[PDB]
Subunit: 260 residues, 2 copies
């Protein structure tokens, strides 16, 4: 409540912003097409300039002013933190996240989820075994704290991520059905989406119980171990949030389904 | 591939996030990360907007309207999904984490990512070699490569780039320190130099320790697809993962060279 104003202060003080008109985005998009398809060397300035030429030509822009304009774009991109200049160029994580969103083929399948669900199961059951038969701070730090902090936490974020890829799909089907209403195909799109949302939560819920117990086991196994307890607390509440959104999305799809 | 440009053009894709809109987006983001029971309602997001309006000395009588506009413009731009209630999209999340989430450059983090990718790669190579049927290929070699190994390579690349900006920042901070007076700030510059030298070396030593064996097993999977032929799609995925891992080790060395370069330069 008083944290989120300090955020604004900070943001305001730092003057953080992104400006990507359609031609700037595309330029950034095309650059990512080389930073993903580039043999092994990193991207030179002449390479960035060449990509600018293409989008420049594509947008009908005056060829005479490229060099000037391309240098301006590249400088904007550095300054807006989407690109790094080394003394050659590399997209920053900001650049990478934004571009990935567009040029990536992030397809959602229940498989992705099941895959991610098992690996964490394994790292979790292991950490739990580790913590049941204790040791020095070195055995705690390495076989129970770290596993939890660096690999459990990270694949809960990956599943969070997979869920959102499913949110993206829902919306697109909505948009797709909204096109077909502007019939029988709409019953198909409605159908198979429910199936997926239903397959999702079954395999989520199924593993969910198992993951939960092993968190519970680890909690049960001391002072000077609170920072392990904290970690476990919000891994739980991260997991529960996922599952809850899991159920949540199925219920409101029924809202959307019978609505047509 | 300038039809991507045609595609971006014909779809009017863009990002328009001025300081006041981004602050709001960051605001929303910190609701999202620090969340008990429930998702994000339109109510929470409006109270979020309030504080950013307050802090930007914006007109208080209009707040309700301008919030609906701001929230609306987030959805349009695809930062946010509205459900009939609000969720940050993949795009929203990436942009947001860039500014907000902690940067952790732990060697041990890396070592465990490498370790679990080693096993996933070993099992997929085992699975391919004795390759059963269509379901077997989809679930046991491809599914781990893309949904698990690809995801970890992304995240290693991602913290290499995080490190890229620690590098440049330091290089900037060192440049300013030795301006006012070179002979005094050397002791501190030597600090900043050697700590980054240390981080970069350690991360690379870990990567190079895993790379040859991750490569071997990626090769095995490629091997087991050429005695078949309906597996172009596993073949292509192996080829990308091979390319990516090589970019990462290679860029790893480039950074060191560049840093040793900068060290010499002072």
């Amino acid at each position: 409540s008083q944290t989120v104003p300090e955020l604004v202060a900070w943001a305001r003080k730092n003057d953080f912003s992104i400006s990507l008109p359609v031609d700037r985005l595309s330029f950034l998009l095309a650059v990512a097409t080389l930073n993903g398809e580039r043999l092994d060397g990193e991207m030179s300035e002449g390479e960035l300039v060449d990509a600018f030429r293409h989008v420049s030509d594509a947008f009908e822009q005056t060829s005479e002013t490229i060099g000037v304009r391309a240098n301006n774009a590249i400088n904007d991109m550095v300054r807006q933190r989407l690109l790094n200049r080394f003394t050659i160029y590399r997209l920053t994580p900001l650049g990478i996240g934004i571009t990935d969103y567009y040029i990536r083929q992030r397809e959602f399948s229940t498989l992705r989820l099941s895959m991610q669900l098992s690996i964490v199961a394994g790292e979790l059951k292991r950490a739990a075994d580790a913590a049941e038969e204790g040791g020095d701070e070195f055995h705690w730090h390495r076989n129970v704290y770290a596993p939890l902090k660096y690999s459990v936490a990270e694949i809960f974020d990956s599943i969070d991520l997979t869920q959102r890829l499913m949110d993206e799909q829902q919306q697109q089907v909505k948009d797709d059905i909204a096109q077909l209403l502007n019939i029988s195909s709409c019953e198909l799109l409605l159908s198979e989406t429910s199936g997926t949302l239903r397959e999702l939560q079954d395999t989520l819920e199924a593993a969910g119980d198992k993951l939960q117990a092993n968190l519970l086991r680890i909690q049960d196994a001391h002072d000077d171990l609170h920072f392990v307890d904290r970690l476990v607390f919000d891994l739980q509440s991260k997991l529960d949030r996922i599952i809850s959104w899991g159920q949540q999305s199925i219920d409101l799809w029924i809202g959307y389904d019978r609505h047509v």
